[PDB]
Amino acid sequence: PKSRRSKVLTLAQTEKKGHEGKAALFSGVQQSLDSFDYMWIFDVTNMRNTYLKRIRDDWKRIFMGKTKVMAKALGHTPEEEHAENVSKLTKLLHGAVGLLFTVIGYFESFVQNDFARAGAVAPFTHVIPAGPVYSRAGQIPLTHTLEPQVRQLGMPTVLKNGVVTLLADFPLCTEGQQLDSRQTRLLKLFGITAAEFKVGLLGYYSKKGASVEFL
Amino acid sequence: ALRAQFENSNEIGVFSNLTNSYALVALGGSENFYSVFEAELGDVVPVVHTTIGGTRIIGRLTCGNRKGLLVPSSTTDNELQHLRNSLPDPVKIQRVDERLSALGNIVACNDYVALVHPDIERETEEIIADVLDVEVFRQTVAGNVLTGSYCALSNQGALVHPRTSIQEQDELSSLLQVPLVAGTINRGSDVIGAGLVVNDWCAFAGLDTTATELAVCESIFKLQD
Amino acid sequence: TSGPRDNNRNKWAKKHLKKGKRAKNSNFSKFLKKK
Amino acid sequence: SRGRGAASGTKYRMTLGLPVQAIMNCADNSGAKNLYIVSVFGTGARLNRLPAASCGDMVLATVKKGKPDLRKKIMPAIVVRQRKAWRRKDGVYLYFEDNAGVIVNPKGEMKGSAITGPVAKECADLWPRIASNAGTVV
Amino acid sequence: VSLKKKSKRRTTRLRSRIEKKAAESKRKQK
Amino acid sequence: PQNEYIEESIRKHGRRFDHEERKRKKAAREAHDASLYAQKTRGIKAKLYQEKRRKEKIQMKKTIKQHEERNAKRMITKATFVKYERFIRPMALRQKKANVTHKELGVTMQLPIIGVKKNPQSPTYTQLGVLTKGTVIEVNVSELGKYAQITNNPELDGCVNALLLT
RNA sequence: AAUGCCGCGGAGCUAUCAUCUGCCGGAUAACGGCUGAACGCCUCUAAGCCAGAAUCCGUGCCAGAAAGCGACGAUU
RNA sequence: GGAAGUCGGCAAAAUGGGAAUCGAUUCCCACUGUCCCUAUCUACUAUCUAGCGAAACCACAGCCUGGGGAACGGGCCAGGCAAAAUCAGCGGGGUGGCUUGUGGCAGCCAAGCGCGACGUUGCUGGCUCUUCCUAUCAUACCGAAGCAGAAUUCGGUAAGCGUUGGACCCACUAAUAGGGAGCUGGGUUCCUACUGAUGAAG
RNA sequence: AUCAGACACCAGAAAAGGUGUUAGUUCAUCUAGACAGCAGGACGGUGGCCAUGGAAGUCGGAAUCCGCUAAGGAGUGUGUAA
C-alpha cells in the first residue's frame, strides 16, 4: 500500500522518559549548582562505565545529562545563569563536562589505561604474527579456540583443522595513523590499552570567590 | 597378488589370459586393464592387446602356457596373424578344430601338466600334447567338467572348489604334482578360473576378492619373495 | 536425458567448433581449394 | 539393477524372435528342462507390441517342466540361442536350430555349471559368467 | 489483442441476470 | 558418520564462506520478496497466502496488544432412526448414536438414541424415525432419559449433533 | 488338365524379419546475482545489467501465393 | 513365436484328439496370420472409353471463430478471410461468471461496529481413434530439509516429449498423471469439409 | 497492469493481502539538534535462585531487586559444550 521502510519492534519494556528525563537532568544540574563545593567540570570521556563508576567512587556526584542541556538550563545570559560570569563559561562548556562533590591531584595524575576507540591515533605500530592467532600478541605463556572469531573477524584468516589460521601477517595498527572502526574492533579482542582518562579543572564556581578561570 | 577390475567387472580371468611368457588383454574397452598389466609385467613378458573372433572373452576362449598358445576354430585369420606378429618367435601358435570352442574352459594347463574336459576329442588331445608339450589327463574337478574355468593352475600352486572332498583334493594333487588348495575367489564365487589368472611369479584377482582370499592365494603360490 | 535443443548441448557443441575439432575441416577445405 | 545388470558391455540391435508366451529349452545342468517366457527386461511403452527377446537378453522365466525346487521362482533367464536368423554386425547371418536359455540370478551368475550346446558370442559377451561356464562359444 | 484468459465482454443473459439478482440482494438486505 | 557429524565438520572446517552475508542479504530483501509474492501469485496459493497473512497479522496485532497492557423407487432421502414401511429406509442412512451437548454443563456426550418423538418438518417422518433439523429425540442420560432437539441437519452434516433440552 | 500337385524360382514389392539418416542461434520463466535508489543504512528492481528450463521465437527440414516476384534465352 | 487377440480358439490348421468334472466345462499335449506385424500373389469391381441410361431428394443455398437473451442458425452483428473450371478418394458435418482445500455444537476472548473476525478450549464398460487444458507421473532446470555420498521427501517454472504388456491383482518401464471437445458385450422378464490430382488467365 | 480499463446498483467469488501511487483524518517528537547515519558507552553486586554432564541474559522453572546515571532490560536476537 506504500513503499515505506519497516519499523521493527521488540519486547524490551525499557522506554525512556525523553522530555521528562531532560527535565530531571535540568533539576539535577540545578541541585548540583546548589551543592556545597568542589565545582568540578568533568562528566565523561572515552573511558568505560567501569572507569566512570571508579571515579564516582572517590566522591560523596558526577552528573551532567545531555551535553549543553545543563548549559541551556543555566542560561548563557548572566541574568538567567545562577552563577556569575557564566556567559564565558557556557561557551567553554562543551562535550562531556559536569560537576561533582567529594581530588585535583587524583584527576591530574591518576589516569588508568583503557581500550582505545576509533578516531584517535595508535601509540605504536601493532603487528600480528601469521599462522595461528595469538590472544596476547605473544605475551601469553594463548588458546586458539576462537573458532567463531574466524567467521566474525574479516581478516585474511582461514579456519583450518578447527584452528583459526592467518595466511599472512596483517598489521593491525600503524603509528601516526588515525584509528578506523575495523582496526579498533580488531584491537578490542587484544590488549590495546591506548587511552588515558583526563579531567578539566580550569576554574571553580565558588560560592564566595565565583571565579571560574579558563586555565 | 594384485587386485584389478576389467571395466567394472570382477571377472578378469574371462577377459584376460596370463602365462609365464606373455600376457593377453581384451581390446576395445578401457586400457586401464592393459595399463595395470603393463605396470607389473611390461618389463618381463610381452603384453598383447588382442581379441579372438571379434570377442573379448579371450581369457576363457584361449588356453596356453609359457611354451605354446591355442585358439579356437572361430578365430579369424587377421586376428591369428595379429597374434603371431605380436608374440615372439620362440612361442608357437596353433588353431584347434575342436567342437568345444571354449579352450579356456575345457583345458587348464600349466607348463608341465594339463587337465582337460573328459569328453575332449582325441585329435585335440594329441595336438595339445604336441603344442603345449605337457602331459594331458582327462578328469573332472569337483564333479564339474569345466576344468579351466573351475580350477586355476600355476607351476607352484593351484586352487579348486571349496565343494571338493579331501580325498578328491589328495587325488588331484597327486595327479598334478603341485600343491592344491580348496578355496574361493571374488568373495564366494566358485569360478576360480574366471576370477583368477596366475603366472609362476605374480597373481591377479578381482578387486572384490577378500583379504583372506588374497592371503590364501599368496600362501599357495609362494609369492611373498 | 537432455535433448538437442538443450542450451548446454549447444554450448559445448560450440566449444567443439571453437577448437581444432573443426580445424580438420579447414585444412580439408583448403586442400581441394588449392588443387 | 537387473536392467543391464552386470552387462560389462553394450549389445547391438538383434532380430527379435522369442516373444512372450514362448516355450524354450533349458541349457544348463541345474536340472530344469523347459522354460516359459513371462516378460522381458528393458521393454518400453509400445502399443500392442508383444515383448520380445534375442540372444543375450534377460527374461522372466518359469520352469514349465523341471525339478520342483528349481520352480516357484520367476527367475531371470538369459536367452543364449535363437532360431530366428539375425544379422551379426560383421555381416553374416546366424541362426541356431533351437531356442535355448539358462536360468540365472538377477545379478548375472547362473545356478548351473556347464552349458550343453552352442553359445552365441553376443550372449557370452554381455554375460561373462555364461562365457566362463560355456563349453562351446560360437 | 485481448491478451486475457477470460473475455471482458459479457452475454445478454449474464448482463440481464445481474439486474435480476442485484435487486433481490437489496430486497434481502432490506 | 556418527551422531552430530556435520557440526564436527563445522567445528573442524568452519561454515561456508559466504553464508553469513548471503543470509543477511536474503533477510534484508525478504521484505520486498513478500510483497512481490503477494502481488504476483494467483489461485489457491494466493488464497492460502491471503488467509495465512490475515491470521499472522491479527496474531501480531494481538501480541503487541498483550505487550501493551503488561507494560502498563420409493425411498427416504433423509437419515432415519430405528404396509407402514412402504418407502425404503437404507440401513446406511440409518443412525443410532448422536452427539448430545449439555447446555448448562457444556459437555458433548456421544450417546445412543433411545427414540424420536416428533419431527417438526413432518410428523410422518417421526414414525419412520427420520432425524431432521429441529427434530425432538429422547436419549438415555444415566451416564450424564431426557429429550433434546437436533441442532443440525443429519442429511448434510452426517453426524447427528443435538442440543440437550435441559 | 477352371493356376492338376510339389521343389527351386530371377525381377518387383516388402519386413524395428533387412539397411541407412534425425541440427544450432536469440528471447525469457522459476531461480542465483551486479550496481543502485526509494528510505543519508540496507536492498536482485524502481531506472539499467549478468547468468539461467526439454520453454517461446527463429535456423534447418516440407509446401510454394495456382491473382507475389527477379534474372536469362529465343522470338514467327 | 503359437491364442500373448477377443467377453471367447469367431474363422482357418492339426485328421480336429487324450485325460478328467457336470453335450457343456477344465486341464496337458497338438496345430495354425486371431495376434506380435504386416508383406506378397490372382480374379472381379472400382478407373478411363464407345453405346445406352435412371432414382431418392430438392424454399433458396452452401467456409470457420465470438455474439446474437432462446434454438444457436446458414442468412443478422464484429472478425479471419475470399479467384474460374474440374478429377479421383474418404464420409466429418444434415440451460447460475456455476465449479475446486480445509466438518457440526458450545464457551472464552475481542480489531471494531447485541453481534463480533482469526484464534483458543471442550466430543462421536471396453476395442481402436484427432486435438486441446495443466490441475506435472516421468524427462529439463531450480529452492528448502540430519540434504555426508547414494537413494529420497516437499515446493516452483515447465504440457516440448512420452505415460506399456497380461489374468484390483504381477511384471516391465524413466513413468505407466488427471481431464475436455467407427463398434460390441453382459445387465431388468447433393453441397461443404479433409486428402491427393489437374487447370484457363494478366 | 510479464495476461490493465472502457462493467452495466462492480452484485458471485467479497473475507482480506500488497515495501504500488495520490489525497486526506487522528496522535507523536523536532536548531534544549528531529528520523537516519556513522564513533563510543550498552556497567558493576551477579555465574541472583532452583534447575545440570555442560546453561554465565539468550536448553529450560516465578519474578527479574538494587550503587551510578545521560543510560546499561536477572536481557532483543545470533552464537558458544560452557
From Swiss-Prot, chain A:
Gene3D superfamilies for the chain: 3.30.70.1730, 3.90.105.20
Keyword Nucleus carried by entry: yes
The entry's keywords: Cytoplasm, Nucleus, Ribosome biogenesis
Localization terms from the record: Nucleus, Nucleolus; Cytoplasm
UniProt cross-references to InterPro entries, sorted A to Z: Mrt4, Ribosomal_uL10, Ribosomal_uL10-like_insert, Ribosomal_uL10-like_insert_sf, Ribosomal_uL10-like_sf, Ribosome_Assembly_uL10
Assembly information from the UniProt record: Associates with the pre-60S ribosomal particle.
Summary of the function given for this chain in its UniProt record: Component of the ribosome assembly machinery. Nuclear paralog of the ribosomal protein P0, it binds pre-60S subunits at an early stage of assembly in the nucleolus, and is replaced by P0 in cytoplasmic pre-60S subunits and mature 80S ribosomes.
Name of protein: Ribosome assembly factor mrt4
Organism: Schizosaccharomyces pombe (strain 972 / ATCC 24843)
Phylogenetic classification of the source organism: Eukaryota, Fungi, Dikarya, Ascomycota, Taphrinomycotina
Gene: mrt4
UniProtKB/Swiss-Prot annotation, chain B:
Protein localization: Cytoplasm; Nucleus, Nucleolus
Residues found modified as Phosphoserine: S173, S174
Alphabetical list of SMART domains matching this protein: eIF6 (SM00654)
GO molecular function, one term: ribosomal large subunit binding
Record bears the keyword Isomerase: no
Keywords for the protein's UniProt record, in alphabetical order: Cytoplasm, Initiation factor, Nucleus, Phosphoprotein, Protein biosynthesis, Ribosome biogenesis
Gene Ontology CC annotations of this record: cytosol; nucleolus; nucleus; preribosome
PANTHER family with a match to the protein in the record: TRANSLATION INITIATION FACTOR 6 (PTHR10784)
Free-text function comment from the UniProt entry: Binds to the 60S ribosomal subunit and prevents its association with the 40S ribosomal subunit to form the 80S initiation complex in the cytoplasm. Is also involved in ribosome biogenesis. Associates with pre-60S subunits in the nucleus and is involved in its nuclear export.
HAMAP family: eIF_6
Assembly mode: Monomer. Associates with the 60S ribosomal subunit.
Annotated family: Belongs to the eIF-6 family.
Protein name: Eukaryotic translation initiation factor 6
Species for this entry: Schizosaccharomyces pombe (strain 972 / ATCC 24843)
Taxonomic lineage of the native organism: Eukaryota, Fungi, Dikarya, Ascomycota, Taphrinomycotina
Swiss-Prot record, chain C:
Low complexity bias locations: 25-35
Domain of life (superkingdom): Eukaryota
Basic residues bias spans: 11-24
Subcellular location: Nucleus, Nucleolus
Family per similarity comment: Belongs to the UPF0642 family.
Name this polypeptide is given: UPF0642 protein C32H8.05
Residues of the full protein shown: 83 to 117 of 117
Curated annotation (Swiss-Prot), chain F:
Disordered, as annotated region: 1-33, 52-72
Disulfide pattern: none
Compositionally biased tracts (Basic and acidic residues): 52-72
Protein keywords: Nucleus, Phosphoprotein, Ribonucleoprotein, Ribosome biogenesis, rRNA processing
Pfam families per record: Ribosomal_S8e
Bias (Basic residues) ranges: 12-27
Motif interval(s): Nuclear localization signal: 10-17
One GO cellular component, as annotated: preribosome
Keyword Zinc: no
UniProt keyword Cytoplasm, yes or no: no
Organism ancestry: Eukaryota, Fungi, Dikarya, Ascomycota, Taphrinomycotina
Functional summary from the UniProt entry: Involved in the biogenesis of the 60S ribosomal subunit. May play a part in the quality control of pre-60S particles.
Location of this chain's protein in the cell: Nucleus, Nucleolus
Coiled coil spans: none
Known partners and oligomeric status: Component of the pre-66S ribosomal particle. Interacts with ppp1/nop7 and nop52/rrp1. Interacts with rsa4 (via WD repeats).
GO aspect biological process, one term: maturation of 5.8S rRNA
Protein name according to UniProt: Ribosome biogenesis protein nsa2
Family per record: Belongs to the eukaryotic ribosomal protein eS8 family. Ribosome biogenesis protein NSA2 subfamily.
